[PDB]
Amino acid sequence: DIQLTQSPSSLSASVGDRVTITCRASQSVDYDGDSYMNWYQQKPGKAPKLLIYAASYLESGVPSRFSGSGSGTDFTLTISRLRPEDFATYYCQQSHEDPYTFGQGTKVEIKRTVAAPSVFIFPPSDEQLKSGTASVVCLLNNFYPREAKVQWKVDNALQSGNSQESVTEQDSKDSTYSLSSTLTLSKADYEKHKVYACEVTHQGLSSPVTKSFNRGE
Amino acid sequence: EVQLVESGGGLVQPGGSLRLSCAVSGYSITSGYSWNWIRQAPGKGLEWVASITYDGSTNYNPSVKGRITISRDDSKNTFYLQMNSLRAEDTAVYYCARGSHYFGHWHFAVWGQGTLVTVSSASTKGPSVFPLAPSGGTAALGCLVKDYFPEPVTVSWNSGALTSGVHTFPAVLQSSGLYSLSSVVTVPSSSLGTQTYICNVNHKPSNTKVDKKVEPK
């Protein structure tokens, strides 16, 4: 098989930057004067979209900021001026011979100024408590960069082992992230305590921000 | 546009068989194109697995060769993938893709939306849907979609009329082996008394469709 190696594997670039990613094939993908390398863009949760065919030709309707060049083993994809919606994984793919093969992808992230999160905390709903479990949810909304710490506290005691986090893919318009953290306890244990807090640490914050509520208002 | 619509995805038991279909917009003529299946394991890159052309030539990626069949029913503008002896590595989003010619070679100009195949012996379970009730000028609210299997769940807001400020988080796999996800939206806190906020939750594997009104307090 023809192995394709993309470089870098990931990159962060500001809006407006010129971005060049490379694809190296383990053998020539030339055939009779043409180079059979394609590029696709894949945004999160979406199917890949063809950008470039035969190394350098833009599929019709693809924005002109995308271009491709190369020959033989070595290929590049350039974004001449990055827009925030260009956050995606970019794949090269050789059409020279079966089996068609893809590179491992280059994940392009957008760099931007640091923004502290806005934090919200949600008590467990009465409907859920009736079913016997308590989920307490902490939302960190629209921050940059992705790195953040959530620490749950129950009657001031620091929790561990009873929470899970998930983070959104970078927003296609403002390039921020959001994070939700869920603390899960049984109804019985939930009603044994009063103060529920999440404490958020982030580069944009000079001291941690705590949101809390007292069970039963 | 032309549309490629995959179906047949879902839960398959290990060692069982997979039968996916790709239905092409009926106005479309399929003779000048190649018809492909390409899959993507969660978090991984793209793997081409099979193609068929107008004269019936099939090609298969040796990575799966021996347990894979691509077939066609032009009278329904439909192409099929069968795979047998499924194993864990076969859990993936399977895409249908249509190849267009470049000097006797193919590039994937049109893609279906992909359908998820989960190789597992576990049982389908529909979620519970709980409100994340609103409690400066912006307030957050949401819906917690708890304890479902398998992926995926989709969430929209007010039947799709509410899109800005929406964050639907990646699901987390809980220690029970069941998934949970939250979807949130930030809205003007002025509109908390006038506006209706309904999250439309769809878990197709369990035929769960819930439209949950999230009111304040």
Numbering used by the authors:
A (entry chain L): 1 to 217
B (entry chain H): 1 to 135, 141 to 222
Copy text from the publication:
As most of this interface involves interactions between the CDRs and the VL domain, and mutating the CDRs could adversely affect the interaction with IgE-Fc, we mutated Ser81 and Gln83 from the VL domain EF loop, which contribute to this interface, to Arg81 and Arg83, respectively, thus incorporating bulkier, charged side chains. Complexes between IgE-Fc and both of the omalizumab-derived Fabs that contained the Ser81Arg and Gln83Arg mutations were eventually crystallized. To understand the effects of the Ser81Arg and Gln83Arg (VL) mutations on Fab crystal packing interactions, we solved the structures of FabXol2 and FabXol3 alone. Both FabXol2 and FabXol3 crystallized in the same crystal form, with one Fab molecule in the asymmetric unit. The packing interactions that involve VL domain residues 81 and 83 in the FabXol and FabXol1 structures are substantially different in the FabXol2 and FabXol3 structures.
Immunoglobulin E (IgE) plays a central role in the allergic response, in which cross-linking of allergen by Fc∊RI-bound IgE triggers mast cell and basophil degranulation and the release of inflammatory mediators. Instead, the Fab alone selectively crystallized in different crystal forms, but their structures revealed intermolecular Fab/Fab interactions that were clearly strong enough to disrupt the Fab/IgE-Fc complexes. Mutations were therefore designed to disrupt two recurring packing interactions observed in the omalizumab Fab crystal structures without interfering with the ability of the omalizumab Fab to recognize IgE-Fc; this led to the successful crystallization and subsequent structure determination of the Fab/IgE-Fc complex.
